[PDB]
Amino acid sequence: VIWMTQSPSSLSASVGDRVTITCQASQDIRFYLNWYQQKPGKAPKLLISDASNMETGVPSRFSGSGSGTDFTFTISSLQPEDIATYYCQQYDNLPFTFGPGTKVDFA
Amino acid sequence: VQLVQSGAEVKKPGASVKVSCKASGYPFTSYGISWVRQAPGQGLEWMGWISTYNGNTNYAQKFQGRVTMTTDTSTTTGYMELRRLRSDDTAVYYCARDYTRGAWFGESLIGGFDNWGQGTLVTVSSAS
Amino acid sequence: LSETKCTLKSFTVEKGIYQTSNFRVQPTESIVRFPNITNLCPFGEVFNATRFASVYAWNRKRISNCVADYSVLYNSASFSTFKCYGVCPTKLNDLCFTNVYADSFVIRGDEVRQIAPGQTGKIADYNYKLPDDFTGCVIAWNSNNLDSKVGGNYNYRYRLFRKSNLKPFERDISTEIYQAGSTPCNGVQGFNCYFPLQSYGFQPTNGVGYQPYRVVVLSFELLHAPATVCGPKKSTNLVKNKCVNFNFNGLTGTGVLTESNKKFLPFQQFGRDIADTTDAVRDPQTLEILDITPCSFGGVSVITPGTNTSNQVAVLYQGVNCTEVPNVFQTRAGCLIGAEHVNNSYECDIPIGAGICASYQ
Amino acid sequence: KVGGNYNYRYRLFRKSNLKPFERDISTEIYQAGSTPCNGVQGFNCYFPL
Amino acid sequence: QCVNLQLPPAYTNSFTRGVYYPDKVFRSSVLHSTQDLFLPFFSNVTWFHADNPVLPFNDGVYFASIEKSNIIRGWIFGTTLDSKTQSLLIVNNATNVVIKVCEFQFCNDPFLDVYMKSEFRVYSSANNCTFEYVSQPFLMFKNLREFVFKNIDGYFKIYSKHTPINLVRDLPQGFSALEPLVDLPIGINITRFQTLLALHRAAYYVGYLQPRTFLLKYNENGTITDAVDCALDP
Amino acid sequence: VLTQSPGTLSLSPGERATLSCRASQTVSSTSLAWYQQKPGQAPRLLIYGASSRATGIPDRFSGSGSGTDFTLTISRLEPEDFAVYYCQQHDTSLTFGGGT
Amino acid sequence: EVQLVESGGGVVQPGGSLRLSCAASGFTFNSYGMHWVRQAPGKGLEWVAFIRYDGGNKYYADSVKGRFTISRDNSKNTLYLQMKSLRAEDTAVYYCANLKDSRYSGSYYDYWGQGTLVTVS
Ligand SMILES: *[C@@H]1O[C@H](CO)[C@@H](O)[C@H](O)[C@H]1NC(C)=O
Ligand SMILES: *[C@@H]1O[C@H](CO)[C@@H](O)[C@H](O)[C@H]1NC(C)=O
Ligand SMILES: *[C@@H]1O[C@H](CO)[C@@H](O)[C@H](O)[C@H]1NC(C)=O
Ligand SMILES: *[C@@H]1O[C@H](CO)[C@@H](O)[C@H](O)[C@H]1NC(C)=O
Ligand SMILES: *[C@@H]1O[C@H](CO)[C@@H](O)[C@H](O)[C@H]1NC(C)=O
Ligand SMILES: *[C@@H]1O[C@H](CO)[C@@H](O)[C@H](O)[C@H]1NC(C)=O
Ligand SMILES: *[C@@H]1O[C@H](CO)[C@@H](O)[C@H](O)[C@H]1NC(C)=O
Ligand SMILES: *[C@@H]1O[C@H](CO)[C@@H](O)[C@H](O)[C@H]1NC(C)=O
Ligand SMILES: *[C@@H]1O[C@H](CO)[C@@H](O)[C@H](O)[C@H]1NC(C)=O
Ligand SMILES: *[C@@H]1O[C@H](CO)[C@@H](O)[C@H](O)[C@H]1NC(C)=O
Ligand SMILES: *[C@@H]1O[C@H](CO)[C@@H](O)[C@H](O)[C@H]1NC(C)=O
């Protein structure tokens, strides 16, 4: 089983700030990683697939990069609508695994 | 793996001290427990060894009749008691996980004291 | 109907009843039941010993009442030899035994090949003998850095002389004088009188075949008794009255489990049928006796008029209740699905069995 | 080579065995424990070749 | 402390006696054929009065006793019966059965000295012990106690049965199977044995087992209720 | 009895260090170990079995020896390598050296 | 247009069993492999099981493997999860989803249902 981890567990940031979230895989998963954003009471929404591929409809302020065990998700300029928990999921090998999730607060 | 011990204690001469050693992060009964003493500014002195599996013990010649070791397998904790305390027994008492002797057969092994604790300071002064 | 056409290997099918397949109830879940052992087996204290015994006086260590992880041994890069007989080391990690014995000693490299069933030679014959039906694993490694000395380590010895070959698992430590001719010795060494044990020349500069090797032989026995040794075990809850896959103390199979009325005596762990299959077991944790019966199965027959009359069919599930199958009629022949039962009577058209016939009306 | 020919290498670490005729030339860091690497070599983090 | 305290043999018929469970697998409602060391039917069994000589062990022993006073406490099994070799000592006391294997230096005529209180006068020394086992007493109208002793592949196996008896200087007729009692991983040779009696300040029978094929009848409850000794007659 | 030398080894950072331990009697290589103790801290095992590295110990540390003469070496002293080292044997009873 | 609707949730006792289902519409259900994911209160997401488009190969997480069964009916456009030997730890909201994947499911689009709560008490 490939375990997933994230850092930090939580962060606080204001509107206009740059937000960086780190995801790590227990083993090399190439570029095969999905990034999901979840708000309370709702199902998760996909923002990025295959490490860097942006989903249609996702604002350009969002990005991501990385390979192997090392992946980063970035918001270049945080908006008030971006307060949510972000999860990273590997789909390289079954069973599939999600990370613990990183919580973003509004400072 | 983590080993923890009791806090510092002060005793009068002729009394006795019992030092605990709680251990976790490994199969407790697979490894023995060793005890080492170190007086201020002094080198390391061995006190003895106990098997967590069968309760078999071995003691250094200076502590025979003075030291008793016991193990609680339900709380994964070792203990060592030193009797007839003297002022020169003032020292830090360390507990470590042992791989110099087998727990089941009691034979010498290729290894050492793999994991140590914080050490319990015992002071033996008549004056408070 | 398509299955009937394929079974008969024909695109046209005549009126009749045809067996086309067999049905079988599949396991709803998989359950594992191993002994409740809290201590791990002392393998570390066997292989990392500071000193090892000689081959003439090999050492025996009994392993019992514990859990064993062989994944640390087979996957180790430290071993030069790891040969198993009667069992796979990768499958050993989920088997159970009544006892495991670890035989340990030191020999020269060239003698390692003698540590195997059916072998002969100075070691196989006079020092350490394994049976032809030996089950277990032979593990060995070079110890030139530990058991050799610059001036030679004559602390290790072997038997050179004997009257006859040893039986399996025998240990002979006699040091009395061997008479090689017809004239006796008086306990005194001399012509035709030799001390039976010889020392090994163990120097660090010696060739590979001459250097010392540490050997551990793991002998595995499975008598009819509560297993005292089991590999890494993950146990599950016990499920009854349903088709399940099970593993009881290393015994794998599939079937329905129920409380048994069989009066087992305390020393009994299981029963057997005339087919040599197990039909009852004792649960290794609760000590409850369970009956084992395999899951419902049987033939599937398709009833049809000729395809030149109709493409309609009915299906007979032979020997089962209609309630276990997933116009449903229960016959003594089994469950008939797709046919309408009527209270009239006619001449038999397509025979079903037990007085029941079917026809296209 | 007299000083050693380190031009030739082999894979020492992997998550699982290769299927027949597979070829893997990834150079990313292998995590051997439970703590992640950050692409950085260190404790429980080893370059696979 | 050892204390220094031959008659012609008497014989009896073992009609259908000494059958035991060959293995631990449950069977029922079946006739099962087995080859093992069994006491032949209607054999001539040696009868002693508790007269305690050293006897040969051969291939295994069927032992039985009839008593109402617990005189027979145990047995000695071994080869040399001295400190030169490992010997097996089996004794019963008021609370437990005690089993030891050591280089015992046995007395010339070993016994247990009874005053309620008892003292063992069995051996003068017990060096280099290799095996020890303690449990509840084996043994604990007259009491008929039956045992089977086997030593195969280093394993010393004991089977037993206990019933009342109202007969006098002989063994009863009828079928009764002996259940497994203990299986000890001792690893020693046995060629001779002796009985251990409690003497204050009963009778026993000895038969020998042979390699015989039996047909055993397991009833609906999985207990053996009948048997045929295939080599007895046509 | 185990004895070590020098009692105090004076070296600058970046330098190679060598520490000796000697025995009153022959000690099997399988029954010797080396430890390090930093100021205010419990001892930690560095080497066991004379020449085997303990878990978590950097490549800077190594050792060798036989008979009555054993050595601990550090290829290059880092600021964290400045500590008191002890040699131990458990071939007969169990004893420690005086430390260096 | 695309919808995924879970049902069959509720409260059950420990050691019991429960059958969950997910109706699908607006998309080619019979073309995609399907996943189950659960989320305990105050916790992150946990992947449960996957089934291929043809209803053949099935996969499970170690936490549910041997207890839970995954199945589907492509004629009724419905996904199912059959849970047995339930424990208190299984209390969670269960979601059916078509997770974007370039290796196994071949899904280009990512869809999730509304979720159904299962409580073990
Ligand atoms: C012997 O000890 C070493 C170091 O602790 C370990 O790597 C090795 O696996 C041990 N061997 C066994 C059988 O435990
Ligand atoms: C399991 O543990 C129980 C006590 O919790 C004990 O009664 C039982 O006999 C054990 N089973 C086995 C096979 O040892
Ligand atoms: C098949 O059906 C046709 C009428 O459609 C009939 O004439 C023919 O005889 C039938 N063949 C057989 C073998 O019954
Ligand atoms: C199965 O069929 C038999 C009659 O053949 C009936 O007695 C029995 O109750 C049925 N079992 C079930 C579960 O309906
Ligand atoms: C056949 O007769 C039974 C009563 O014997 C009745 O219950 C059943 O409904 C009848 N079925 C048909 C098709 O007439
Ligand atoms: C019994 O006989 C032996 C052998 O002669 C002798 O050594 C022992 O002292 C005698 N015991 C008594 C009580 O006389
Ligand atoms: C019986 O033997 C056991 C084991 O040696 C001992 O503990 C017990 O006290 C003995 N009983 C009596 C009455 O001597
Ligand atoms: C055990 O037997 C050995 C000979 O194999 C003998 O030298 C030794 O003295 C015996 N030990 C005791 C306590 O008798
Ligand atoms: C035990 O019996 C075997 C087989 O006859 C024999 O080789 C061995 O020497 C005997 N050992 C003793 C102590 O009698
Ligand atoms: C088998 O046991 C039952 C009680 O469970 C009893 O009624 C029956 O008579 C026994 N059969 C025999 C032959 O003893
Ligand atoms: C095809 O879809 C129809 C509903 O439009 C359904 O009734 C039928 O069973 C489906 N067939 C297959 C093979 O899925």
Residue numbers in the entry:
A (entry chain B): 1 to 107
B (entry chain G): 2 to 129
C (entry chain A): 296 to 621, 641 to 675
D (entry chain D): 444 to 492
E (entry chain K): 14 to 18, 23 to 67, 80 to 144, 153 to 177, 186 to 246, 263 to 295
F (entry chain I): 3 to 102
G (entry chain C): 1 to 121
Source paper text:
The S2 subunit contains the fusion machinery and undergoes large-scale conformational changes to drive fusion of the virus and host membranes, enabling genome delivery and initiation of infection.
The B.1.617.1 variant S harbors T95I, G142D, E154K, L452R, E484Q, D614G, P681R and Q1071H substitutions whereas the B.1.617.2 variant S carries T19R, G142D, E156G, L452R, T478K, D614G, P681R and D950N substitutions and a deletion of residues 157 and 158 (157–158del). E484Q, L452R, and T478K mutations are part of antigenic site I which we previously showed to be immunodominant (16–18). The E484Q mutation is conservative, but could alter electrostatic interactions, as it substitutes the side chain carboxylic group with an amide group through replacement of an oxygen with a nitrogen atom. S309, the parent mAb of sotrovimab which has received an emergency use authorization from the FDA, is unaffected by antigenic drift observed in variants of concern and interest, including B.1.617.1 and B.1.617.2(+), due to recognition of a conserved RBD epitope, as illustrated here. Our structural data integrated with previous studies emphasize that S309 is a variant-proof neutralizing mAb which is thus far resilient to the emergence of SARS-CoV-2 variants.
